[PDB]
Write a protein that binds this ligand. Sequence first.
Ligand SMILES: [Zn+2]
Length: 46
Amino acid sequence: GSSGSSGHGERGHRCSDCGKFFLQASNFIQHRRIHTGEKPSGPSSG
Ligand SMILES: [Zn+2]
């Protein structure tokens, strides 16, 4: 149904892979990497 990523939060940066929170973009970027590596059987990167 009509729905998606509303977000609308210009306060820090929250992760979607795990669900954490950050304040410094950089710190938020170096965090999204930890997830970058292995992928679950099924959905592959394109
Ligand atoms: Zn994360």
